[PDB]
Amino acid sequence: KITNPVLKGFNPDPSICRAGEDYYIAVSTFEWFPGVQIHHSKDLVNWHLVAHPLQRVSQLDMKGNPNSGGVWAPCLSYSDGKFWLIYTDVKVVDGAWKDCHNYLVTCETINGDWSEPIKLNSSGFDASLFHDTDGKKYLLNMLWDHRIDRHSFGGIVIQEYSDKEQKLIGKPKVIFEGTDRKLTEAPHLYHIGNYYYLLTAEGGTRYEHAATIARSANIEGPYEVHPDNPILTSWHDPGNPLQKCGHASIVQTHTDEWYLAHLTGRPIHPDDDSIFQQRGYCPLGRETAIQKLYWKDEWPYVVGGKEGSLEVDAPSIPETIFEATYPEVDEFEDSTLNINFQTLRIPFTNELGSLTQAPNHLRLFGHESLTSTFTQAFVARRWQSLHFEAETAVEFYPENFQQAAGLVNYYNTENWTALQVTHDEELGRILELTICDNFSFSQPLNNKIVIPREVKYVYLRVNIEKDKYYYFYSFNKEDWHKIDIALESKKLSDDYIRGGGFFTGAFVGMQCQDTGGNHIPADFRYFRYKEK
Amino acid sequence: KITNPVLKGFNPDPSICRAGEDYYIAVSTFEWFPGVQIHHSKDLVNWHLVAHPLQRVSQLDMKGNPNSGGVWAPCLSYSDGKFWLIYTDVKVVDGAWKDCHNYLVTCETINGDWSEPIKLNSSGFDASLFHDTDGKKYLLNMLWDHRIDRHSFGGIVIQEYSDKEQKLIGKPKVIFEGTDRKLTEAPHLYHIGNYYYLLTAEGGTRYEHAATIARSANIEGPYEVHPDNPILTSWHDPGNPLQKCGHASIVQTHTDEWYLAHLTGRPIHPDDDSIFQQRGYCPLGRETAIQKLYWKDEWPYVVGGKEGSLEVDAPSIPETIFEATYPEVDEFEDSTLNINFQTLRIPFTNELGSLTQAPNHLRLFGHESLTSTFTQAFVARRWQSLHFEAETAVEFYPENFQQAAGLVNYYNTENWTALQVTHDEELGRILELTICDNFSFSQPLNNKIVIPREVKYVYLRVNIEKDKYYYFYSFNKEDWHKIDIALESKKLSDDYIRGGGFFTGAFVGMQCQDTGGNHIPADFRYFRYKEK
Amino acid sequence: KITNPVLKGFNPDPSICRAGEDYYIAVSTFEWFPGVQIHHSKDLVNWHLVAHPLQRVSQLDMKGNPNSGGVWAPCLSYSDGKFWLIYTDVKVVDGAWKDCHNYLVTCETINGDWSEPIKLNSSGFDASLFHDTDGKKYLLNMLWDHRIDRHSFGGIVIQEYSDKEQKLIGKPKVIFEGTDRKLTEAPHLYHIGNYYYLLTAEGGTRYEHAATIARSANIEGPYEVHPDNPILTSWHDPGNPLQKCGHASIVQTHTDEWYLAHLTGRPIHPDDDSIFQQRGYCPLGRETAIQKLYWKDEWPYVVGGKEGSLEVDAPSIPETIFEATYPEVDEFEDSTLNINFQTLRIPFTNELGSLTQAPNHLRLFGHESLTSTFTQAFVARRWQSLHFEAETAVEFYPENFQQAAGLVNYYNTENWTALQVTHDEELGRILELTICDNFSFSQPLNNKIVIPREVKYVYLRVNIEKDKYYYFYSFNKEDWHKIDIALESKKLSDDYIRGGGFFTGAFVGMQCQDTGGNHIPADFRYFRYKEK
């Protein structure tokens, strides 16, 4: 009944919660704005993107943030008639430190105007708010240890949160130090029956990823780990469809059934290497899956095995399907950017672009290049399948070589490919392909593609076919020309990019840059996205 | 008479200009705030720091800026009864692109409140404003070419600036492409006699650095280069006291004498290598020197040779000495931070610290670590000699290992050494030494230094002795203890650090970090700096 | 009964074979001379080193061989009243190619004078001779594919060997391509019952190492893999005492019992990392272990699980213990170098040293440095425990700084530590510590240790304590002095050193170098080795 992944493409660190008969899953967004994606569902089978809480700079200011910084694992809960969202803003993703700050924002509705952030702490990421049955609230998070002679993951800390005083009270204390899997993080507390279940993620978000659970009669612990721990992991099984299974969250349906949401990666193996050595590449990044749970001796177990299955029995609730959140062909007729579209770090303002200046078009004013962590006029959407076709049409009249606009497949500032309309001093308007492979730049087209002066719209297309993708262009929307270069999809995956931050996924979108200072506009007639 | 360097320590890209009988030199400050350092002089022999124009976030927002980004070479000029300051904010310092934006701010006085920035262009750095004798103004700057098959330095461009419309008018055009020295930048135009002299810097800011000059009857050119070009360079002479001689600016005194301000580096040779292969390390970064000029056949020449001399004949103007801009021992009795003190990227606010909360103390509230490009509670000053002694006393009571405060010798987020008072779970308060060598972290003290509970102030000192420096500490201002580790000064130099940005210099200051979230205060009683 | 590892220390790629009621295991030696170590046993519990077949340059010429080159996995068999030894001489261990040559030498006795080599082929390493029940012989080996678009491991090839013509006949052909574990190598054929069992090693010699088996009615195949393959591997179990379990060989005792010899690594975890990410370091290199087998449905299985156990049931044969092959303190009274001692690449000749010139001493004439792949006067023995104490006494009178002699703990030319008596121009005789960490040299002793002129013998000792080892010295055999530097044992392990060749292990021995040309002698009075 439930077919995983439930949330395809870049949708990591799922935080599932129930509000009456409605189910929500908050996922990490990192540098993508607006921050935190929230999906909704009635039956746990069918889902749809409904909100992005962090829409204001006062809530989330990520200009200048390093790749894979910003919003890490979020925590969404429901209590006292409102939603509670705990999020982090990571400023440093490399080195001995991991400078970050945890905040809290609330809202009675999932898609309403969330409150201004309440400062919590900064001792570590993966902060989570636990609502105990006695009315008390506690904040959990991992402790980051920068000291040389100690492992960076110093354990799980807890501290009571005063709702009235809007701050953490008392003193924090370590309640769990993890198992031999180490890299203990993603703490989530649950008061079920006569025990307090502490759920954590261990082994890192790569292939050693796992979800461990422990219990204690008292909240302070010590916690005893599950007899068959980890309750979720596929490290030992490279053949399993779902990999990197960890960073989970538990939910009890209104039908008294138990499920476990968790992130996962579906890798491709294009190099023909030994899967045991080279586990694979995930262009779709880390996605969200949901496993079913069963109880035995007051211990939760994953139905079908700890590895995680693709097909899972759905709860006993009537089916509720939702309409598509995006049209196959977006004609930009609405004054609001489609919810599936996001910008880098900063909000989409009149400065970056407009949907009203040029009716039925997405106008993007040229700004900084694709290697900039500050201001990019780039509107993109996630790669939610390894078999799709994205397309757009752009009216662009560049006057200098520092002006380019087109279709761009992107992971981070150091990894991307771009097919843009630009200006050559001798040839005039040309269609150029630029590649940034882990900061290794190249413009492989020896024979530049010249664009006739009478061409109003330059049609750009990209076809993703599992391990490879190709670019196509057209001047009249009938005759398409293929750019004879088989680009590798693995180069836009979490497993390929360098750096301490590799927590996003491949994106495809419309972009315009003007490093000359003229902020030249680029008009995109439409944006098509169709999965096979 | 004039003893070079005139501006010691981190003071690169000098832009000298005359205002009546007053002389000013604006230098680059990069990530250090407030931006742009302006020095004043009457006789060109004696100088003193007088102002930092960019004090507001609206003028300069560098939060998140990469190391050596931000404020590059500035251009200070005087015309129409006011000062004109052209500055750049570089966002990207590595890769094919060098995303930056040029701005203009004015002020009738050198230390008054400068105006809000006027957007100019972004085609390249080293922007300069030229005031022609006919009342017309022109903006010069180097053209950055990101394209693979071409040099990044695409020549010198010029475009007329409309003072009335507050914007560049017409179209820009290349007027000079440089010589075989390449890396043509730092364009400065001067209308002297029957010619327009275009001064530029070539060969890069390292040891191949040079200053070239060309002339033309008309402003558009083409420009003919000096017959004995470059007019300034010591590349061919590794033994010359002044190295990296380039990025100059010309000034004509009120006594009708000509001088050439330029950046320079005074390297040390600690490794005992061949100076021809390994030219040396400059812990003091790039400093400012002034050479005397002489005319012959309508061409300027450097007096004493193009290499540059230490002793230069001063102009025929009476001597005017200035009082020290800083006390040997700063007791923090003033509510204003000494002008020689600067912070990283952001302004010094009540959030970061205070000089009023704890009278006669510099209170610093713990923030992010030394590896953060965002918010650091770090107040530092430049190393203006290779023979000095810096000292401070701090009252700190850390409760967790994520809180540390002390003395810190710093270059960038990846290169620094820190002697801080911190907390150990087993030992309590301890004095720890942390080292970040090109992002390689270490804490070499095997035997931790335990600080007794009754100790109110922990005295920290550092002695710089040319190629090496040592840390000292004390608990009662009588008995000093040496930390037996000979730290190398070369590790805090432009020539040692990795990355595309290596344009600052060594700094020494007071710091406090609290990655726990408590923003714990650290009280520094004083800050002593005494050169030998 | 059987306690693994049976062969401790550097003793990889075990090739077990039975000769009546005697059992032998041939292991790889790589650059160490004499080539191939052969151990003997009667009960499979107690073992002892008895021979090194390749003692002549005509058989093995490894002068100039790269680290971890030379003798790779050997194949020892018994048939027609004599022993057959297949060995390889690998010349290239990095890049697209792996230039090597396979040879065959025979001898009626295990420790007699083996014959001159018979050239076989060069298509790949891991050559093995199979003696079929019909009197026919076949050579097996892996196929190395250097071509870019294919895996280097091109499968298992077989070709009939003519004993009469002393050469391979007919044409070779691929009979097996392996499983998803890949890196298929170490082919061994066994004709048991109605099937031909092809045993191979897969997943590489690191932690993904495994032993796979397949069967076929006919020798040409195709071969069907074991239903629960691999039959041996501990990749999925980082907690297992035995790691890197692969490259096995099967033996049927005279008591009709089955056992499986295989290499294994016992890693230490000194960095406090996650064992799932960082599996560990093996200073003892790859050792040999023996598992018991059991048959079911004509398929062999490892008793106790595929991971491999420490305690294994011994065969039903009476216990036969052997006397120690080496004295705790070697006083060098015999004219024969102890069998446990080996030299690098070349044989121990009068040119390198002598046991007769200076009776009761091991005289070593100074030659090339420890970084030379040619001629080193270095006599060493393996580290067969992570808890031992090695000691020696040397009488050395160096006259120049290019002469040094002492105690050395070595892995390869780029990884070692040495405590040697040398000459300083100002201080005279001094004791210096030199370190080569992955080709990064350093002499960390700031205060040089001066040796008084009246000192005849300089006592040198080293204490290995699991993850760390320390050097000690003395001038009178009573008062020891500890060099305060905690050296890491992980730096002399297979998992730490760089390069394509990482197949040996840590050694400890006596050395003397004279890069001046004088070949200065160094007299070592004794060599002690005592395991805790």
Swiss-Prot record, chains A, B, C:
Q: Positions of the site: Important for catalytic activity, responsible for pKa modulation of the active site Glu and correct orientation of both the proton donor and substrate?
A: 126
The keyword Nucleotide-binding is annotated on this UniProt entry: no
Q: Which GO terms describe its cellular component?
A: plasma membrane
Top-level taxon: Bacteria
What's any GO biological process attached to this entry?
xylan catabolic process
Q: What Gene3D superfamilies would the database entry show?
A: 2.60.120.200, Glycosyl hydrolase domain, family 43 (2.115.10.20)
Its localization reads: Cell membrane
Any idea which UniProt keywords this protein has? Carbohydrate metabolism, Cell membrane, Glycosidase, Hydrolase, Membrane, Polysaccharide degradation, Xylan degradation
Q: Name one Pfam family in it.
A: Glyco_hydro_43
- Which reactions does this protein catalyse? Hydrolysis of (1->4)-beta-D-xylans, to remove successive D-xylose residues from the non-reducing termini
> What triggers or suppresses the expression of this protein?
Up-regulated by xylose. Subject to carbon catabolite repression (CCR).
Quaternary context: Homodimer.
* UniProt-recorded name of the protein: Beta-xylosidase
Which gene does this sequence derive from?
xynB
